[PDB]
């Protein structure tokens, strides 16, 4: 129960990070910065598979 409870906390943390990276990607396209975007929108996706 203790280990599963922490796993829930940990997955919640990863989801927060994925959403953060997406927000940062969006913010980046507001300067047409495709570089940053294609990267954060990726570091994020890979991590949603790491879930």
């Amino acid at each position: 129960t203790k280990d599963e409870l922490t796993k829930i906390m940990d997955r919640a943390s990863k989801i927060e990070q994925i959403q953060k990276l997406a927000k940062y990607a969006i913010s980046a396209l507001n300067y047409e910065d495709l570089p940053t975007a294609k990267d954060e929108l990726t570091k994020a996706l890979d991590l949603l598979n790491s879930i």
């Binding site: 913010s27 507001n30 300067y31 047409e32 910065d33």
Partner: protein, 311 residues
């Protein structure tokens, strides 16, 4: 009857504030959501009563209070430490009682207090009678026996939150740290503070600016933009020589010997009919070389202490 009331009408939009989406969220749900949706707040679900803002100087705290004051559509009171501390013995405290009293009379309402550190600090016996009487009335009158804690809202600001006493820290039940702005927020403040002035740069050039300006405050941005707006006056009145360009006559500073370069001083030139060269990137970088960041980093370590604990 004392009646030391004061309130006013400023003008600051939401979106002129950069970053701070947690504070924007908490104040929209603390201001707009009670007025627009009073039916959601009923019984067990109650609005927030005490909200604290804190951080390093010039991260946008009082300007955010201006934005709440414009976007309030409510009786926005505001009081410093001046109007609370009275002469004799008794009006120092009864004015606090009348402040929250008439604040509840004009409900729904919002109360802002700037630099609440001048009213706290019960530890020790320094600042004895003013701290115990006035601070005691702030506690009990803020919530107590029969105070209607619903309705009004107490906005606290400070620069020193660790000297704030833990009891008033509990009174301000939802506290928010306001950091230095990051890259994108300072890009936004650059693109706001250029305003209607015809600039020369693009958005990623403002990104180059914010990358160059790592770790400023909002006032630092305001003065490098100010200096950037004060370079063309220096060039339009500098040395000798202006020139016509283009609604009837219009002259700007130009180098000695140029296409239509007359020799004169700004003094020689007629009201209005003088225009300065549009802000340029060099003026920005010159303003970056003009001024350090204001804040110190060990104070940032204490802000990370109180923020890391109570934020």
């Amino acid at each position: 009857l004392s009646s030391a009331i004061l309130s006013e009408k400023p003008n600051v939009k939401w979106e002129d504030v950069a970053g701070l989406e947690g504070a924007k969220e908490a104040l929209k749900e603390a201001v707009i959501l009670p007025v627009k949706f009073p039916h959601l707040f009923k019984g067990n679900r109650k609005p927030t009563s005490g909200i604290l803002l804190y951080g390093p100087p010039g991260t946008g705290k009082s300007y955010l209070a201006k934005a709440v004051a414009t976007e309030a559509n409510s009786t926005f009171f505001s009081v410093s430490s001046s109007d609370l501390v009275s002469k004799w013995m008794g009006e120092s405290e009864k004015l606090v009682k009348q402040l929250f009293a008439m604040a509840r009379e004009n409900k729904p309402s919002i109360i802002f207090i700037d630099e609440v550190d001048a009213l706290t600090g019960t530890r020790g016996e320094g600042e004895s009678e003013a701290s115990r009487r006035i601070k005691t009335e702030l506690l009990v009158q803020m919530n107590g026996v029969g105070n209607d804690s619903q309705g009004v809202l107490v906005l606290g600001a400070t620069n020193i939150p660790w000297q704030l006493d833990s009891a008033i820290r509990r009174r301000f039940e939802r506290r928010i740290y306001i950091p230095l702005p990051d890259l994108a927020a300072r890009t936004t403040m650059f693109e706001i503070n250029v305003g209607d002035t015809p600039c020369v740069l693009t958005k990623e050039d403002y990104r180059t600016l914010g990358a160059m300006t790592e770790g400023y405050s909002g006032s630092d941005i305001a003065v490098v933009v100010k200096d950037a707006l004060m370079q063309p006056i220096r060039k339009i009145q500098s040395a000798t020589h202006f020139k016509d360009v283009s609604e009837t006559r219009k002259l700007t500073p130009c180098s000695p010997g140029d296409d239509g370069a007359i020799e004169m001083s700004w003094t020689d030139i007629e009201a209005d009919e003088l225009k300065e060269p549009d802000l340029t990137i060099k003026d920005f970088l010159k303003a970056i070389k003009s001024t350090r960041p204001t804040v110190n980093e060990d104070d940032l370590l204490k802000q990370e202490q109180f923020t890391r604990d109570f934020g």
